[PDB]
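From the pipeline queue, job 12 of 40. The input is one protein chain; the requested action is below.

Action: predict structure.
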Amino acid sequence: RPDFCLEPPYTGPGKARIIRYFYNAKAGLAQTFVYGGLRAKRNNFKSAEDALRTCGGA
């Protein structure tokens, strides 16, 4: 599983409220979170299906 999949979600400094997905490795689930629109990290997906394919494990 890529190492960036183990990071907590990162909202960042932007003032937007954009609903994105992160992979929660401890839970084993893709979950939603509020992203501010600036300086996303890689554990920040546009969909659940993308989060799971990238971070869900082989």
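Job complete. The first strand starts at residue 18 and ends at 24.
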